Design a protein around this ligand. Structure first.
Ligand SMILES: *[C@@H]1O[C@H](CO)[C@@H](O[C@@H]2O[C@H](CO)[C@@H](O[C@@H]3O[C@H](CO[C@H]4O[C@H](CO)[C@@H](O)[C@H](O)[C@@H]4O)[C@@H](O)[C@H](O)[C@@H]3O)[C@H](O)[C@H]2NC(C)=O)[C@H](O)[C@H]1NC(C)=O
Ligand SMILES: *[C@@H]1O[C@H](CO)[C@@H](O[C@@H]2O[C@H](CO)[C@@H](O[C@@H]3O[C@H](CO[C@H]4O[C@H](CO)[C@@H](O)[C@H](O)[C@@H]4O)[C@@H](O)[C@H](O)[C@@H]3O)[C@H](O)[C@H]2NC(C)=O)[C@H](O)[C@H]1NC(C)=O
Ligand SMILES: *[C@@H]1O[C@H](CO)[C@@H](O[C@@H]2O[C@H](CO)[C@@H](O[C@@H]3O[C@H](CO)[C@@H](O)[C@H](O)[C@@H]3O)[C@H](O)[C@H]2NC(C)=O)[C@H](O)[C@H]1NC(C)=O
Ligand SMILES: *[C@@H]1O[C@H](CO)[C@@H](O[C@@H]2O[C@H](CO)[C@@H](O[C@@H]3O[C@H](CO)[C@@H](O)[C@H](O)[C@@H]3O)[C@H](O)[C@H]2NC(C)=O)[C@H](O)[C@H]1NC(C)=O
Ligand SMILES: *[C@@H]1O[C@H](CO)[C@@H](O[C@@H]2O[C@H](CO)[C@@H](O[C@@H]3O[C@H](CO)[C@@H](O)[C@H](O)[C@@H]3O)[C@H](O)[C@H]2NC(C)=O)[C@H](O)[C@H]1NC(C)=O
Ligand SMILES: *[C@@H]1O[C@H](CO)[C@@H](O[C@@H]2O[C@H](CO)[C@@H](O[C@@H]3O[C@H](CO)[C@@H](O)[C@H](O)[C@@H]3O)[C@H](O)[C@H]2NC(C)=O)[C@H](O)[C@H]1NC(C)=O
Ligand SMILES: *[C@@H]1O[C@H](CO)[C@@H](O[C@@H]2O[C@H](CO)[C@@H](O)[C@H](O)[C@H]2NC(C)=O)[C@H](O)[C@H]1NC(C)=O
Ligand SMILES: *[C@@H]1O[C@H](CO)[C@@H](O[C@@H]2O[C@H](CO)[C@@H](O)[C@H](O)[C@H]2NC(C)=O)[C@H](O)[C@H]1NC(C)=O
Ligand SMILES: *[C@@H]1O[C@H](CO)[C@@H](O[C@@H]2O[C@H](CO)[C@@H](O)[C@H](O)[C@H]2NC(C)=O)[C@H](O)[C@H]1NC(C)=O
Ligand SMILES: *[C@@H]1O[C@H](CO)[C@@H](O[C@@H]2O[C@H](CO)[C@@H](O)[C@H](O)[C@H]2NC(C)=O)[C@H](O)[C@H]1NC(C)=O
Ligand SMILES: *[C@@H]1O[C@H](CO)[C@@H](O[C@@H]2O[C@H](CO)[C@@H](O)[C@H](O)[C@H]2NC(C)=O)[C@H](O)[C@H]1NC(C)=O
Ligand SMILES: *[C@@H]1O[C@H](CO)[C@@H](O[C@@H]2O[C@H](CO)[C@@H](O)[C@H](O)[C@H]2NC(C)=O)[C@H](O)[C@H]1NC(C)=O
Ligand SMILES: *[C@@H]1O[C@H](CO)[C@@H](O[C@@H]2O[C@H](CO)[C@@H](O)[C@H](O)[C@H]2NC(C)=O)[C@H](O)[C@H]1NC(C)=O
Ligand code: NAG
Ligand code: NAG
Ligand code: NAG
Ligand code: NAG
Lengths: 767, 767
């Protein structure tokens, strides 16, 4: 509630349905908590700042607070550790969540309210755990005590937990003890635990009674214990004699609701089937970064995982061993419900069709990761049986053509699963990611029996070929093709002619043959592509073109950034003026970073009629005309950021009748016209940030136009806060226009003592 | 003769033994020929400048001139073409050589003296050749008429040569017609020709009588005619139907003294043995960039080349064909005198021992080039039979570990053979250049049967390994090892321990594992290397080191540039002060680009006692102390160029008693001390160029010290030419100290009209 604030430099968000008020003071360099904080707020954000300590009077009048964030308030360049006065949180009866990460605290704070449910104490100096200060947390549910003693934040003392310290926490559900130099699992954990995170510790042995009472546990993490330290870019201490993490056979017996089990980087050598005897509902299993190269050939334990969804076996290669072929066990056929399989880091020479026979009967298999394996010989025709597969990974391996602040400062989710990189090519269907391979030329015979491919990634292969319309012949149903970081010779206009169903084509980073001058550059090759929608050819350094115009009856998006359009539009050269005129259906243009000092008169007449998104960022426009914008009758998102313009148009209404997203970020504008926004009711977005503007007059910014503006930015500029802008000073602190960084970035240059003064916090009584 | 010049801005070199005087006015921006040119000069250099035309009075008083250079005086940004007045060269009776390249001349200049022997007319607009203007050249010997009409300098007209134009040039020896758009070989050439250069032309057919009278010809070039235009980065036009350069069988019949024959890039398909029936003394043969992939398997013509020295067969691959193995004909055993063999661009999958059997009996074979072939499988043990070989090339191909201005503006030599890149590893003996390959880890078994290797290049392989002293075990006689552009983990001090005879070690560009902090960096691994002489570990970004000191009893050169020595020598950290103290035999240090803002007091005390070459360039030294140089009792080549120093030492004699090569290039020094060079007789080299110096007093630059100075640079600075430096003005134009760029770079800032005035050309009579 309270809606209208007074001088708070933090953003305020209201959710009447959720009855939640959010105050975000992230990155504000506040030495002390600002005054005038509303009593109706619920979430308080107090991240990286210069707060010396916490006083009980800080939250004296705040009783509706349910979330307090104090993450990374002093990162070890920082003064002494934060000191919390006694009874500094007892007044918050409605408190439920509290974050105190990165505060260099020595002991657990006391006096916490009994209504607390979440507590985060990561990146602190708490290496001792006793029941006395845990008695007050009898109602907690989620506890985060990780990252208290490890290589980034050392304490030189092993973690000490007294007996049955967590036993009385009956409401505990999630416990995290990562990177805490723990040696022994802290028995006895409460029986209501669901997620246990003990990874990246120094645990060497597991007792048979360690998880004897945990029956509702769902997520268990035991990574980093006795890790594989070979070629490790971080300080890690292998266990002695390389010994693996000793886990008894009857260890995971009481676990019945377990769903996620992570054993990554444990130097394991054998996986006994007795471990998975009781856990029948296991879904995700991680066994990466171990020494299970021989176990994969046996994989006898896979017979006890009928409901497995994810299986990770990455980076299990043997030192000084180069396998001739992948040895997949026949027990892999028992994974009926398997969906994702990762066999990276299993470096081997040749991949054959019969080596993937166990995976032929997996109906639910979708992702098959095989990248970073240095595969030399691989017949691509063997994938004709994996039509149901969604993503096939053939990454940096060497397949060739066939011969004849800190972490806790952000990410409030804390313990979260590794989110897979969702590439733009996955949404189109079947994907064959052949990027960064040893393919140097394309044959139509290699891609045979692959008519089902809806996507193909060939970036980074460094292919030097002159396509003429016969290479991608079998790929009849291909819709997305990536050809970035290659050497494409556009000597023929029939390139990509046989890709009848192609929609998105990417030929970026092909600067080699485009940099040369005098050779033919058939830029009209898009005429044959009937259903092409998007074409990305940026960073190509295109300086000349044999074709006068580019023709396409279906192209909608065109990225032409990082090229040389100044030479194409050189003074006295009107050949390539109407280069984009024939693109009838084009709606978005991205001609940026083209070193365009000036725009020759006539290019706007040669623009496509349906243009809607024009970008000219980082171009260095010394003088950009404005009266020619009348030709574009559909322009809505003109962008001129990071340019060297110096004058705004006399009347924006006379220039464009549909512009609504004007952007002039990081420009050099000292003053605006006296009728800049006169009768321009169609505008909704405007940006003048990072400029050299001095003052704004009333006649240039009418309130009628300003009422409908969704966003307006005037920060990080050179405004002068003198007595000549009393109307601006009154309006900036009396309007409802969303102006971000109104009290943090926009300051006053002068005069005199007014340096660094906040414009919204100005009151010139003498004016 | 004449020794002493007056105001010439060109360097003068005298050779009394050769009676030759050289005047070099290269890159001087001389609008007109300067006055006061000596009459005793012999070679005149008048390269790129702004000379509008040539007048007969230019060389009126010069009669001893034997060489005039006018190369690239107007490169097509340039005014109208150079105009030569009639009878502008008839007065030079002693003229023998004349260069007129890059002058946009339309016709051959007339009135040349009969004593001329060399004439260069490259990069001109002369596309017509007639006997009338060639009559005056009856005594010429070397003619250069190439680069007159091609893609860089087009003329849109085919070259026209009248019948028997060159017939009467009886003294002609070398003729060049490259890139001249020639269609037919200009019959009839004189019988005294020795070198003929007709490459890069449009010749489609050769007649049987084309070389009927040439019996003394030694070098013949026919490249570029009907070239292989596939993947060509320059505008080239294939011949029709791909047809090859039609050469009759009885074409090279009259040639008996031919030694070099170049047929590179001719789209040849078959090489009949009848061509080499008469030429028995052939030494170098070039057949690269052709379609002779099938002919290599036959190579029937090789039986007629018993004295062949060089054989080039690079880039003869078949389009859309990936050969399984290299098919070398058995006729290669007939090349008894073969020394260099290049089989690049013959892309094939696997290389076996038996495929190199024909080369097993070549006793004189030294270089075997096999790079850029995409070889996948290659057993390195098969090279044990090629012990007599000097260089073995295993370049960018994908071998993996075994499994289980213009051109004529410079280069006065013109037509010169392709000089092979002499790498630094060739002088040490046998070389196995395995750079840029697909090797990702090193095994001792792979390098078996290779104990004869004296050099090994492994740069660019991107190997991530933690060597402990057992990988390079069979390489007992290795003396040079290159490990640049890799990922070396220095976790053990026993790395490279088994390389007992290693002398030069290069571990540069290994920034990956050195950038990480907290991991061990054993920098004392050089202790085991008993005979190590040079160690290059630059561009490694070394910021921390576990070892306190580096120990080596034989190291003499150490390159430590592009690292982070500021953190190692951070204020309050005296652990790594004596890092280089234990290098007893060290004589050269290259600690540059280390971001050293300042040198902590004590590093000079920790320097090796025998240090002789210290470099601190591009370091940003805000304030460099000078009294501490007394510790270094053997310093001779101190370098502080491209730094931010601001003060010279009070007395250089008190600082160092042996410094003789002080360098302060591109520094920021406004003034010198009044006793900078007092009693410093041991100095021989001094540099203060590119500084902000204002004036030099007499008491700081005594003539006694200046007499023994070999070189002194004071150019490109901010000297003021006022009445306060009359002694400096008198001395600069009255001393014999070698001061380069005395009349071209060093100017006067002021005062007023004295902007840009030459100091040596100053005479202040009013002073
Ligand atoms: C202001 O503070 C409020 C508390 O003081 C915040 O309310 C919290 O909002 C989160 C969601 O953002 C709730 O989390 C719940 O989690 C359960 C369990 O899901 C678990 O598993 C999923 C994966 O399947 C994982 O993503 C979750 O993080 C959990 O680990 C869900 O079933 C719920 O739908 C919900 O996501 C908290 O419970 C809730 N706290 C309270 C006390 O209600 C609020 O988000 C804050 N607002 C801002 C803007 O910061
Ligand atoms: C000043 O001008 C003088 C002429 O006006 C220059 O004298 C010339 O010097 C060059 C050497 O630099 C002489 O070239 C001769 O070439 C023959 C034949 O060798 C040929 O083959 C070799 C490869 O084996 C090749 O490198 C050569 O270039 C030749 O193609 C050699 O046997 C000789 O030793 C010598 O190298 C000229 O003959 C000579 N000209 C005259 C008229 O004597 C002088 O170099 C100029 N000085 C400067 C500083 O520019
Ligand atoms: C994680 O906990 C272990 C607990 O053992 C820590 O190991 C301990 O580390 C300290 C500090 O390096 C060692 O103290 C050292 O003692 C030697 C004398 O023995 C002294 O010369 C050193 O200067 C240092 O004070 C201690 O010995 C060592 N404990 C054992 C059993 O070896 C480890 O440091 C902790 N990790 C982190 C990141 O804090
Ligand atoms: C085809 O495969 C290539 C390589 O596997 C993909 O290129 C890679 O794409 C990812 C995601 O866009 C890039 O990651 C990003 O890197 C930038 C730094 O450049 C970083 O700031 C981002 O946060 C993100 O991590 C990755 O750099 C890029 N690699 C290269 C060499 O460009 C490509 O996206 C794939 N194409 C399709 C259509 O999936
Ligand atoms: C090397 O010599 C050949 C000699 O044929 C040159 O080919 C000629 O090039 C000119 C200029 O492109 C061609 O003229 C053209 O004529 C057409 C009408 O046919 C006209 O529309 C064009 O605007 C142009 O004026 C000429 O036809 C062509 N000769 C032949 C037989 O095709 C070649 O250009 C020369 N190369 C260089 C680099 O100068
Ligand atoms: C081992 O093999 C590698 C690669 O074959 C050699 O590196 C290459 O060395 C050459 C000659 O020094 C470099 O050429 C130079 O390039 C610079 C531009 O960087 C240019 O300004 C010079 O004029 C010259 O052309 C080449 O760049 C370099 N390649 C790489 C990737 O660094 C290396 O020299 C070999 N080592 C030994 C001991 O032979
Ligand atoms: C694939 O892995 C399996 C399991 O490790 C290998 O089978 C074992 O092979 C060894 C060596 O011959 C025998 O001593 C074991 O008795 C075998 N066990 C079983 C269960 O068969 C198999 O040889 C591997 N295949 C390849 C090609 O590497
Ligand atoms: C990759 O596998 C496919 C199919 O397994 C091979 O295709 C065979 O090609 C030959 C010659 O073209 C035909 O006679 C066969 O009938 C094809 N097989 C089938 C099942 O139709 C292809 O040759 C393999 N690639 C390589 C390099 O061996
Ligand atoms: C596209 O390029 C391919 C590759 O050169 C052409 O295929 C060749 O065509 C020629 C002429 O008909 C034949 O002599 C070759 O035998 C063909 N090679 C192969 C491997 O089939 C193809 O004709 C070109 N297509 C177009 C339309 O230009
Ligand atoms: C793309 O434009 C080029 C010209 O820039 C077209 O090439 C011309 O094609 C016609 C028809 O065969 C020929 O008569 C011309 O001689 C060609 N000119 C050149 C310079 O090659 C090409 O056809 C166009 N392609 C498409 C698909 O429209
Ligand atoms: C290596 O090259 C030789 C010469 O081209 C090949 O020998 C020819 O092979 C073809 C095809 O079998 C025959 O028609 C010719 O009669 C052969 N000529 C001679 C002189 O033998 C040979 O087959 C090639 N070898 C390989 C492995 O490619
Ligand atoms: C590369 O060639 C060498 C020699 O031709 C092979 O060395 C053989 O290795 C086996 C097993 O170690 C021995 O039994 C043989 O006696 C060796 N040959 C000789 C001549 O001594 C080596 O195995 C080959 N590399 C590969 C990967 O096959
Ligand atoms: C290089 O220096 C390291 C120390 O920086 C040496 O490692 C020590 O070796 C001794 C002898 O075995 C041990 O007692 C120490 O515990 C080691 N210290 C560390 C930090 O590892 C190493 O021996 C030196 N190597 C050489 C060749 O002198
Ligand atoms: C124009 O591009 C911007 C880029 O962020 C996008 O937000 C906007 O929706 C686009 N407008 C249209 C009409 O596509
Ligand atoms: C500017 O707008 C006014 C008012 O609509 C109109 O009368 C005038 O013609 C316009 N001028 C231009 C150049 O568009
Ligand atoms: C010092 O290095 C320079 C670098 O050019 C070299 O010229 C000089 O000979 C070296 N001096 C000694 C004594 O090695
Ligand atoms: C400087 O040199 C003079 C003369 O040799 C000597 O007397 C004096 O002690 C020296 N001072 C220093 C600091 O070296």
């Amino acid at each position: 509630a309270r809606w209208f604030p007074k001088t708070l430099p933090c953003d305020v968000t209201l959710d009447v349905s959720k009855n939640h008020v959010i105050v975000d003071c992230t990155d504000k360099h506040l030495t002390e908590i600002p005054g005038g904080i509303p009593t109706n707020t619920t979430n308080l954000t107090l991240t990286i700042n210069h707060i010396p300590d916490i006083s009980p009077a800080s939250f004296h009048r705040l009783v509706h607070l349910v979330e307090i964030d104090f993450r990374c308030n002093c990162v070890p360049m920082c003064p002494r550790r934060l000191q919390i006065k006694p009874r500094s949180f007892s007044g918050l009866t409605y408190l439920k969540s509290l974050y105190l990460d990165g505060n260099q605290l020595l002991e657990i704070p006391q006096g916490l309210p009994p209504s607390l449910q979440l507590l985060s104490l990561e990146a602190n100096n708490i290496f001792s755990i006793r029941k006395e200060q845990l008695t007050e947390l009898a109602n907690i549910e989620i506890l985060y005590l990780g990252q208290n003693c490890y290589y980034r934040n050392p304490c030189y003392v092993s973690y000490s937990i007294e007996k049955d310290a967590f036993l009385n926490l009956t409401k505990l559900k999630v416990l995290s003890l990562k990177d805490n130099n723990v040696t022994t699992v802290p028995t006895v954990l409460p029986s209501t635990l669901t997620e246990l995170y003990l990874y990246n510790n120094m645990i060497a042995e597991i007792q048979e009674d360690d998880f004897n009472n945990l029956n509702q546990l769902q997520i268990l993490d035991l990574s980093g214990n006795c890790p594989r330290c070979y070629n490790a870019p971080f300080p890690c201490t292998p266990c002695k004699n390389n010994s693996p993490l000793q886990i008894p056979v009857n260890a995971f017996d009481a676990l019945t609701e377990l769903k996620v089990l992570r054993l990554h980087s444990n130097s394991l050598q054998h996986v006994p089937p007795r471990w998975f005897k009781n856990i029948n509902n296991l879904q995700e299993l991680d066994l990466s970064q171990n020494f299970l190269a021989k176990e994969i050939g046996d994989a006898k334990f896979l017979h006890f995982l009928p409901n497995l969804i994810q299986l990770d076996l990455s980076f299990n290669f043997e030192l000084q061993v180069y396998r001739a072929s992948m040895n997949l066990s026949q027990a892999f056929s028992s994974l009926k419900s398997l969906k994702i399989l990762r066999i990276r880091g299993y470096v081997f020479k040749e991949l054959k069709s019969f080596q993937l026979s166990p995976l032929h009967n997996l109906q639910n298999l979708e992702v098959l990761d095989l990248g970073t394996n240095f595969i030399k010989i691989a017949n691509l025709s063997m994938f004709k049986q994996f039509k149901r597969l969604k993503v096939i990974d053939l990454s940096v391996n060497k397949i060739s053509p066939s011969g004849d602040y800190a972490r806790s400062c952000r990410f409030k989710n804390k313990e979260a699963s590794f989110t897979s990189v969702q590439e733009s090519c996955y949404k189109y269907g079947q994907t064959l990611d052949l990027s960064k391979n040893s393919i140097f030329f394309i044959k139509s015979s290699d891609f045979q029996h692959l008519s089902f491919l809806k996507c193909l990634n060939l970036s980074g292969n460094l292919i030097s070929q002159t396509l003429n319309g016969s290479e991608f012949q079998p790929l009849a149903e291909l819709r997305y093709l990536d050809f970035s970081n290659n050497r494409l010779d556009l000597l023929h206009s029939t390139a990509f002619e046989e890709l009848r169903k192609l929609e998105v084509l990417d030929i970026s980073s092909n600067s080699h043959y485009f940099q040369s001058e005098g050779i033919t550059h058939m830029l009209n090759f898009t005429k044959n592509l009937k259903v092409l929608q998007k074409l990305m050819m940026n960073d190509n350094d295109i300086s000349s073109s044999t074709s006068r115009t580019m023709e396409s009856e279906s192209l909608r998006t065109l990225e032409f950034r990082g090229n040389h359009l100044d030479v194409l539009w050189r003074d006295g050269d009107n050949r390539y003026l109407q280069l984009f005129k024939n693109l009838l259906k084009l709606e978005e243009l991205d001609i940026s970073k083209n070193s365009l000092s000036f725009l020759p008169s006539g290019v706007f007449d040669g623009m496509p009629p349906n243009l809607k998104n024009l970008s000219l960022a980082k171009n260095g426009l010394k003088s950009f005309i404005w009266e020619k914008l009348r030709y574009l009758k559909n322009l809505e998102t003109l962008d001129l950021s990071h340019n060297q313009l110096t004058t705004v148009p006399e009347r924006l209404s006379n220039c464009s009748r549909s512009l609504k997203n004007l952007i002039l970020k990081n420009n050099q504008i000292r003053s605006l016209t006296k009728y800049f926004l006169q009768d321009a009711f169609q505008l909704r977005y405007l940006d003048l940030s990072s400029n050299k503007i001095q003052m704004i007059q009333k006649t240039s910014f009418p309130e009628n136009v300003l009422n409908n503006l969704k966003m307006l930015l005037l920060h990080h500029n050179r405004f002068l806060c003198t007595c000549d802008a009393v109307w601006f000073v009154w309006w900036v602190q009396h309007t409802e226009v969303t102006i971000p960084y109104l009290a943090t970035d926009v300051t006053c240059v002068g005069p005199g003592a007014h340096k660094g003064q906040s414009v919204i916090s100005l009151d010139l009584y003498t004016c």
